[PDB]
Design an enzyme around this catalytic site. Sequence first.
Site, PDB file in Angstrom:
ATOM      1  N   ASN B 155       8.307   4.417   5.897  1.00 55.51           N
ATOM      2  CA  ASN B 155       9.244   5.395   6.446  1.00 55.51           C
ATOM      3  C   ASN B 155      10.697   5.004   6.188  1.00 55.51           C
ATOM      4  O   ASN B 155      11.513   5.842   5.784  1.00 55.51           O
ATOM      5  CB  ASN B 155       8.976   5.605   7.938  1.00 55.51           C
ATOM      6  CG  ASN B 155       9.054   4.319   8.735  1.00 55.51           C
ATOM      7  OD1 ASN B 155       8.889   3.228   8.191  1.00 55.51           O
ATOM      8  ND2 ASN B 155       9.311   4.441  10.033  1.00 55.51           N
ATOM      9  N   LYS B 178       6.215  -7.798   1.113  1.00 53.33           N
ATOM     10  CA  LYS B 178       5.240  -6.871   0.553  1.00 53.33           C
ATOM     11  C   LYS B 178       5.566  -5.465   1.032  1.00 53.33           C
ATOM     12  O   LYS B 178       5.250  -5.112   2.181  1.00 53.33           O
ATOM     13  CB  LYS B 178       3.816  -7.255   0.968  1.00 53.33           C
ATOM     14  CG  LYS B 178       2.733  -6.472   0.235  1.00 53.33           C
ATOM     15  CD  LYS B 178       1.503  -6.279   1.109  1.00 53.33           C
ATOM     16  CE  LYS B 178       1.751  -5.229   2.181  1.00 53.33           C
ATOM     17  NZ  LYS B 178       1.893  -3.862   1.609  1.00 53.33           N
ATOM     18  N   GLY B 230       4.038  -1.431  11.209  1.00 52.94           N
ATOM     19  CA  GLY B 230       2.981  -0.514  10.808  1.00 52.94           C
ATOM     20  C   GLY B 230       2.194   0.014  11.988  1.00 52.94           C
ATOM     21  O   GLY B 230       2.739   0.227  13.077  1.00 52.94           O
ATOM     22  N   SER B 231       0.902   0.230  11.753  1.00 49.42           N
ATOM     23  CA  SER B 231       0.021   0.854  12.734  1.00 49.42           C
ATOM     24  C   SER B 231      -0.600  -0.189  13.660  1.00 49.42           C
ATOM     25  O   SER B 231      -0.638  -1.386  13.360  1.00 49.42           O
ATOM     26  CB  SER B 231      -1.090   1.627  12.030  1.00 49.42           C
ATOM     27  OG  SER B 231      -1.843   0.767  11.196  1.00 49.42           O
ATOM     28  N   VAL B 232      -1.115   0.298  14.790  1.00 49.55           N
ATOM     29  CA  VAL B 232      -1.799  -0.586  15.737  1.00 49.55           C
ATOM     30  C   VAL B 232      -3.069  -1.198  15.161  1.00 49.55           C
ATOM     31  O   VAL B 232      -3.241  -2.422  15.270  1.00 49.55           O
ATOM     32  CB  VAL B 232      -1.984   0.119  17.099  1.00 49.55           C
ATOM     33  CG1 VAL B 232      -2.732  -0.783  18.062  1.00 49.55           C
ATOM     34  CG2 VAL B 232      -0.638   0.518  17.665  1.00 49.55           C
ATOM     35  N   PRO B 233      -3.980  -0.437  14.535  1.00 46.35           N
ATOM     36  CA  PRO B 233      -5.161  -1.085  13.937  1.00 46.35           C
ATOM     37  C   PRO B 233      -4.825  -2.112  12.867  1.00 46.35           C
ATOM     38  O   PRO B 233      -5.471  -3.166  12.804  1.00 46.35           O
ATOM     39  CB  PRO B 233      -5.981   0.094  13.385  1.00 46.35           C
ATOM     40  CG  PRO B 233      -5.035   1.248  13.332  1.00 46.35           C
ATOM     41  CD  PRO B 233      -4.051   1.030  14.432  1.00 46.35           C
ATOM     42  N   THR B 234      -3.836  -1.832  12.017  1.00 48.67           N
ATOM     43  CA  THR B 234      -3.486  -2.787  10.970  1.00 48.67           C
ATOM     44  C   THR B 234      -2.756  -3.994  11.550  1.00 48.67           C
ATOM     45  O   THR B 234      -3.015  -5.134  11.148  1.00 48.67           O
ATOM     46  CB  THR B 234      -2.653  -2.108   9.880  1.00 48.67           C
ATOM     47  OG1 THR B 234      -3.409  -1.039   9.297  1.00 48.67           O
ATOM     48  CG2 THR B 234      -2.282  -3.108   8.800  1.00 48.67           C
ATOM     49  N   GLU B 252       5.844  -4.610  15.109  1.00 48.96           N
ATOM     50  CA  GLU B 252       6.393  -3.311  15.486  1.00 48.96           C
ATOM     51  C   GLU B 252       5.316  -2.290  15.149  1.00 48.96           C
ATOM     52  O   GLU B 252       5.026  -2.060  13.970  1.00 48.96           O
ATOM     53  CB  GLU B 252       7.676  -3.019  14.708  1.00 48.96           C
ATOM     54  N   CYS B 286       9.379   5.204  13.702  1.00 50.49           N
ATOM     55  CA  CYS B 286       8.735   4.264  14.617  1.00 50.49           C
ATOM     56  C   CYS B 286       8.776   4.741  16.061  1.00 50.49           C
ATOM     57  O   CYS B 286       7.751   4.784  16.750  1.00 50.49           O
ATOM     58  CB  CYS B 286       9.453   2.909  14.535  1.00 50.49           C
ATOM     59  SG  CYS B 286       8.912   1.777  13.229  1.00 50.49           S
ATOM     60  N   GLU B 389       0.046   8.952  18.104  1.00 54.96           N
ATOM     61  CA  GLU B 389       1.234   9.023  17.261  1.00 54.96           C
ATOM     62  C   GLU B 389       0.934   9.880  16.037  1.00 54.96           C
ATOM     63  O   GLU B 389       0.022   9.573  15.264  1.00 54.96           O
ATOM     64  CB  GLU B 389       1.640   7.615  16.830  1.00 54.96           C
ATOM     65  CG  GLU B 389       2.897   7.553  15.970  1.00 54.96           C
ATOM     66  CD  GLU B 389       3.373   6.124  15.736  1.00 54.96           C
ATOM     67  OE1 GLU B 389       2.564   5.295  15.269  1.00 54.96           O
ATOM     68  OE2 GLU B 389       4.554   5.828  16.018  1.00 54.96           O
ATOM     69  N   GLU B 466      13.559  -7.095  16.373  1.00 54.18           N
ATOM     70  CA  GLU B 466      14.461  -7.098  15.233  1.00 54.18           C
ATOM     71  C   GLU B 466      15.834  -6.648  15.713  1.00 54.18           C
ATOM     72  O   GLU B 466      15.948  -5.917  16.701  1.00 54.18           O
ATOM     73  CB  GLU B 466      13.965  -6.164  14.121  1.00 54.18           C
ATOM     74  CG  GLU B 466      12.956  -6.806  13.182  1.00 54.18           C
ATOM     75  CD  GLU B 466      12.129  -5.786  12.430  1.00 54.18           C
ATOM     76  OE1 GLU B 466      11.610  -4.850  13.076  1.00 54.18           O
ATOM     77  OE2 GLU B 466      12.000  -5.915  11.195  1.00 54.18           O
TER      78      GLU B 466
END
Lengths: 493, 492, 492, 492
Positions: B155, B178, B230-234, B252, B286, B389, B466
């Site tokens: 994003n 990355k 990124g996402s919660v699962p990742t 985050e 975010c 989200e 951050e």
Amino acid sequence: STGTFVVSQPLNYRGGARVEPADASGTEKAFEPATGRVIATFTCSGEKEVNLAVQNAKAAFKIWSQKSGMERCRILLEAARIIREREDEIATMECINNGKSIFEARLDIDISWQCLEYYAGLAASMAGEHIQLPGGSFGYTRREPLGVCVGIGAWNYPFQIASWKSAPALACGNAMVFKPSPFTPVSALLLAEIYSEAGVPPGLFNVVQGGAATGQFLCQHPDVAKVSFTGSVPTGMKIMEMSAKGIKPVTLELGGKSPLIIFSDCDMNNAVKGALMANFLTQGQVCCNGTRVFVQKEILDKFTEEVVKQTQRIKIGDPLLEDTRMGPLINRPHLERVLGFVKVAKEQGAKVLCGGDIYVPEDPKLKDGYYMRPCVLTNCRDDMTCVKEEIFGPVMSILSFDTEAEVLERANDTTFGLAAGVFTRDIQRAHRVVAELQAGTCFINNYNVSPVELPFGGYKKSGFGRENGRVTIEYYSQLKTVCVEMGDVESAF
Amino acid sequence: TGTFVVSQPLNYRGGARVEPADASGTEKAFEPATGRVIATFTCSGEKEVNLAVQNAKAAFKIWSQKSGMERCRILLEAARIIREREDEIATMECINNGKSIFEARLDIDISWQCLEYYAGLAASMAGEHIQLPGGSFGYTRREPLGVCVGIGAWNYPFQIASWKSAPALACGNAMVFKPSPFTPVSALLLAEIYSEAGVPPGLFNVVQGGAATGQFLCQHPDVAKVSFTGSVPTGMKIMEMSAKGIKPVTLELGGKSPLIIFSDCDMNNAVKGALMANFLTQGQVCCNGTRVFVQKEILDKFTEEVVKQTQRIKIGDPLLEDTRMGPLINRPHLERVLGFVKVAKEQGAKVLCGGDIYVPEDPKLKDGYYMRPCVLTNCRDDMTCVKEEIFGPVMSILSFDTEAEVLERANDTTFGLAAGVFTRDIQRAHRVVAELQAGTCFINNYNVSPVELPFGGYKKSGFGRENGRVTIEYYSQLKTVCVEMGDVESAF
Amino acid sequence: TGTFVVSQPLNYRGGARVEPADASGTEKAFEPATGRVIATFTCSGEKEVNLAVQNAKAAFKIWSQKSGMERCRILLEAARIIREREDEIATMECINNGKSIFEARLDIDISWQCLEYYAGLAASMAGEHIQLPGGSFGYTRREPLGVCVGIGAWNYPFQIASWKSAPALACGNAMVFKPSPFTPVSALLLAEIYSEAGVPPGLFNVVQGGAATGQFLCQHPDVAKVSFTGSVPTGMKIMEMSAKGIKPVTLELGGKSPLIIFSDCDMNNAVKGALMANFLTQGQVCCNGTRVFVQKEILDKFTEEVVKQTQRIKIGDPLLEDTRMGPLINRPHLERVLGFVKVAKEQGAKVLCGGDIYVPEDPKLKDGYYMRPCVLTNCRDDMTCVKEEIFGPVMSILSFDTEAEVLERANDTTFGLAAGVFTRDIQRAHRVVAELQAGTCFINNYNVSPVELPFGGYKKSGFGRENGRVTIEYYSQLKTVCVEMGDVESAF
Amino acid sequence: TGTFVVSQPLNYRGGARVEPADASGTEKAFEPATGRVIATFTCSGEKEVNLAVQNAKAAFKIWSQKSGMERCRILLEAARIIREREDEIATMECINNGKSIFEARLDIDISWQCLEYYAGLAASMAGEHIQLPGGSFGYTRREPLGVCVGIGAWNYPFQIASWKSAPALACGNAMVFKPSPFTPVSALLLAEIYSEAGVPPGLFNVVQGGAATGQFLCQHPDVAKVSFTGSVPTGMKIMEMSAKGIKPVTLELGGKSPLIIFSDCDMNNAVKGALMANFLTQGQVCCNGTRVFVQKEILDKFTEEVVKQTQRIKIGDPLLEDTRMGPLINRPHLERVLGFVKVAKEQGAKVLCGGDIYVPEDPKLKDGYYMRPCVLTNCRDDMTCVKEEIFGPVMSILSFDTEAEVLERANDTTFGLAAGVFTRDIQRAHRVVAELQAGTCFINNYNVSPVELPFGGYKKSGFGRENGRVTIEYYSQLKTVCVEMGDVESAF
Ligand SMILES: NC(=O)c1ccc[n+]([C@@H]2O[C@H](COP(=O)([O-])OP(=O)(O)OC[C@H]3O[C@@H](n4cnc5c(N)ncnc54)[C@H](O)[C@@H]3O)[C@@H](O)[C@H]2O)c1
């Protein structure tokens, strides 16, 4: 008073009172290591009991977090006062269950109430920021508590770890559910009783007994906001993996294999005493112990002969005797583990200079205790098993070195990184060696003198996070950014 | 704005652009405005990740020898180069990400301001000195961590690389970054700018790739710390992998932030705030305030105003000066967002405007990934669009009566990234903010996060920060040094 | 009834009663018919558990030297002594457990019949002999395991002690048995009968205690196998502890068994079958058909006929010949069962009869733990009383239409212990059984599990078997013996 | 050899090779003879496990509807395809595992013979029928469990896949197989062959991964049974996870098997037998006789003949017809095995030959993981190399005097997988075997486990069996069906 006590009350603590657990996850037996008797056989807390603990501590967190830092400061100072008044009662119980000498236990209780007093003061000045932003607007940070924090304790310094984990947690506004080591369940309840008498809301510091299962229930409870762990590297790995399921922050103390570097320009008298304090306190069961004693070739013989002379003069006996300086080890399975490390040292080429064998004290009441003599090894090599792995017993490995650059490479040749020590009088070498040591706490010309005012924690596989000092506040509190718009919203659309 | 393809390799090692040594995949990067591919590139495999990690601690041992002021000077040079390349970076950011040039410039500005803020913080970076009993004393050395890993999101590509690299390099660390495989292009410009600024070769390396590449980065024994967006699962996977190496993590994880509009608020500002809380960067933010709670007494007037301004949002070519909403990041994500609207209307929500495919007038944009900004009403807390989200331009408007009610519902989430309150009563504003379980709270505005203050999550939105000062604690560690000034008092 | 107290030690090793060497706490055993305390005893600690295991290991060294016929001879003597003391055992069973003398006699019969069945199985116990290529051959020795642990339950104390000891001792094993702390008494009578039958002293030892004693037994290094009967949460604990020593486990964890009544059935048998499926041993029967599915066309006549017979069940002193329902096991369990009834009424179930405390006419039974057997109607699959095992006399009547519907609902459980179907269509009867995910299926009867066939669990009701031939495989193990009749053909 | 590289995906679902859906890391499999990587594959994530387990459930409902003979016909076709592709499978087995082509041909032979044996066992698979009192009767249905999980080992990849899949599928089950990450390739060939034979798609699925993937498999609520082959610590962990779901487990955990050589033996056969007990599959064998007890009167002559023959074992290219020892599985395992020798030399044992790195003549083998077969003498029961499983070519020779002494020393272990005796006295042979607490005992040979007899562990070598008839009892379960032929006799 050794061989005389057995637990009377229940061993869990909830609602500002003692309680038996609701459901179980096993049954352990806590021993008196000086004699071998069973002071306690108790029930490991199951899921419903753990849930009761977290839930009852969450209600106390609601009350505690509403007070200002000074208001929390007042109560933690009273708890520190009660600890000073009950020091001899607390220390005696700590010795009976842990096995360390009464001399050391009093020092452990000192570091415990000093931790409470230190963080009480830190609570009173806890603050966020206020920042002037452009256009008259501004922002500020609220330093807020986390919620219900979980403390998983260790058996070597039971009451101190309960005090070192609960003090910064409760000072930041949190509640704590603390799970003591199954080996040492008793002393943590005295701290829970002292917090309530000091005036904390019932439930602010709850105690649940248990082993791996109980800790797993605690680390996975959805209402546990943070986990503080002290223990082994394999277990700490598991604790972080469980906390990943709930996005829980973790701080860790994972032991170590800390290096102690003795240069030939050192003060010999301090280096010998320092090496002993780096290896034989609390029966050598000390995570930040300087167990790789590097001695420069020019002083190896004088250092070794002096170290062996003083190690052999360590009084072993009843932990409750004033002149005793080494009691029994925590339990027989750990004694056999330590003795096993010694047997492999002799097989790998190390020379046992003293100790390392079973000790039978003169007192017949200590006949079945878990005793051994403190051991000093020489002719050690970096590739030895006793040199790489944490023994957690009184096993000093003396290794020779030639140059400063060489010993730094060997000192850092570990996955551990908890502590380190250097003995030298050259100012530049002292500060340079310490700056290169990949360790959390570095001692120059002393050892095991970590103050309460400064952070203690690991580098590398010794963990991350800190206890003591100011930075620990950042691990028991979190900052909320609050932007305050002083004008109108300028829309982009 | 329909003409770009990368001509150079997309990994960045040793101070130069280079192609990866091995592969873990093959992905296509798009210009979302046109839907045409700008790059088909190779995802970095294990050996390439190893080349970037060891090349980074070659630069970490050179960089950590410098003092904070020495690092400050060089990071200040990088910040100046970003200002001079503003339009080149922003235009490149737009082509690959899709956000308006208006927003991209704001992202590039917030990016170099972040470097300046942390360059300045480096200049004063310090430990403590404490007098101890008996004349002895102790001090703390604030030391870097080593090779830090930055895993970016799509994003805010260039800004996330700057928000992660600035505190890392300011603390003395190196970084291997990355980027999201969706947005690989802009991160190389930051690496080129770091090199021109004078950092040791390897200090900021870029490896492109996805889950496999990211897994290699989190498990390398020489990676000292991981920062994830990124996402919660990742993010969950990121924490589970880091346990194997005892690696510290900051996270985050997005959010479902509440925006509470009280009846005593300034209506004009509250309406603008709700739009700024939902439709910047195509709603792919975010910390967007996507649950807009509006007090019952003002619900209708507020709703009518928000829709009127939403329908006036210019959709089109991101590189046009007047565009304020570009395309979404890629086709699979546009269909994900469109699905959320269809399921919302199935659950009883009333779509007031947008939520459907938009076909712009310009024929060059026919295959872009466009949609109109969406406003939902008649929403309930149990709806999927209210719980999950969406990461798209979908505002869910929910009514409330009392302050006590909206506080319980606003906090009824596993997320806790941001929150917003619009009200003129000083006591209610700070009181609502004090009770909101969210990392960043905006009073009478939204999405105005400054570099001087921390941004991060509460609860399942992550932990760590951050920006601001506290972020130093996650990119540096304190070494306690006890200095004995007397003799050792032995116990034996 | 109302006269008995334990006047001897309650642990057994070395062919004699003995008190434990160390303690795990103390429990009180009750006379449930009166609430009288008949025993306060010590729960065994680790040292007492070790004495029983080693004493069993020595007795196992003798017992395993005898042939199957030799072991058969002794178990046949044990079976005869049980027959001769049947009413003394039954009377003891009633006083401590509470079930009627009518049922107690039937339990003691299945106990000695179990010993006889396994005595006979021992006499023919065998491995294999298989001719292999090249004139060589192999054979299997069916050898005992060693010291097996039996963890008993309170509902069928003496029968559970016999069901665990019979295949164990018939296969050549010794057994240390831990009865339920609620019912410690009856198991000692079996230990005395084994000693008189001629087993080596120590072959069947009894240790009293609760979870702690059971934990010590499952973790003792000399325990070769554990057989457990109890709840699902405790069975998990049994498996978790046994993993530490790699000890084999078989489990019976109760159930929520469905009883399906089709409209073409014999109504008179279906009604009586439903009673036998629910009200034996005060409904404290794991394999009870407590979800009684009744086809819609016969729901009213079945229900009204079921209710008429349930209200005629004589409740009172279990030692009276006319008693068919005694008290529940203890006060906490009676209140638990009453809680299920009270919550059922809150969830929408209609109490047609029972579910309340019963006050018997006999004043000496005033403090017993009595209640009336309960029949519920208007039940739904999602009710708590329909999913969870109540372990009391609480029949839930549920209506169904088709076979396909009732099979999906009957199997919609994590349990799988028993099941029952009443119908006269031959194809439907065998078909329903084949679709039922349950260990034991009754066609046109219920609770008639014979000793000649296996009884055990499916799914979370456990695994392994009691009764039948296959139980040999869980109390014995096969050693393959290859006998080379030629030369070794080397590969090198 | 050196040529091969994996082209296609390595997971197998729905009849075809497929990339896993989510990831749990990356691992590399090598060609041990060369060290060149043959495959760098994805480790199956949780979503991928849920896919494979679910896809196998649908195939289980299809496959269990067929009769045993119908399943027999299909499994016989799978055995035939293995015979037709035997030369292709063995070559693939060697490349990834390292064993000689000589042994691999024997592994593929034992694999299809296992399928043929279990196809036949399916054809006669049956329950019982028993006449019961009063004209009633009962019968047992031998029914499958559902989706069984097979967790393979790296030493015998295709055979372990075949030894686990054959009895499972013959009983009516489906299987999801997780190979060891070291050797993932050969299992895919077995999945392709099952599909070509005509099994329903999904009946045999392959998921690659390590501990995480195996944890997802053992804890999936739809996994009915777990079969594990590996080490004692991991199998213990396998049992602890299965306790959460009440899943039945069978385990084979290796051993430290004794080989007893009496002085009356045929010296020539005992020497060849000692080699066959230690150096097949580079000594990486479940049940190898690595504690070789030699009677004092023959110790010297046996030792020198063992050493003379051990030094004549040809080490080289596994794909060469004359090779009899290839490389070890991987570098960490070679260094682990070399460590055992280093600890043996530190404990006082005399190395007679081997134990050191081998550098083959073929230049393509320079980076292979080769070592010379090792023979130790002067060994003591308390040595680490005598107690612990080395899983390499390391024979520990110990002297003994009497039979009673060697029996106590042979049993002085926590293991109990295999055992061996060399003697011509009939009584001592059968007497020694009867006292050895081991699952398989070899008389006058070693490592000749036939498919017709059960092979499995005693004590901490595991429980359960593979091969033979009793293995059916672990892949099937018995449903007791009581058939009432009269009326229900109510107790009330
Ligand atoms: N399946 C059956 O045949 C059967 C029989 C009786 C009861 N039950 C079920 O069990 C339910 C619970 O009643 P419970 O409280 O008797 O069941 P429970 O399983 O707790 O007690 C069963 C046995 O296990 C022992 N035990 C308890 N904790 C243990 C541990 N941690 N380690 C080892 N042994 C341990 C107990 O002492 C008792 O002997 C009943 O309500 C009923 O549903 C089933």
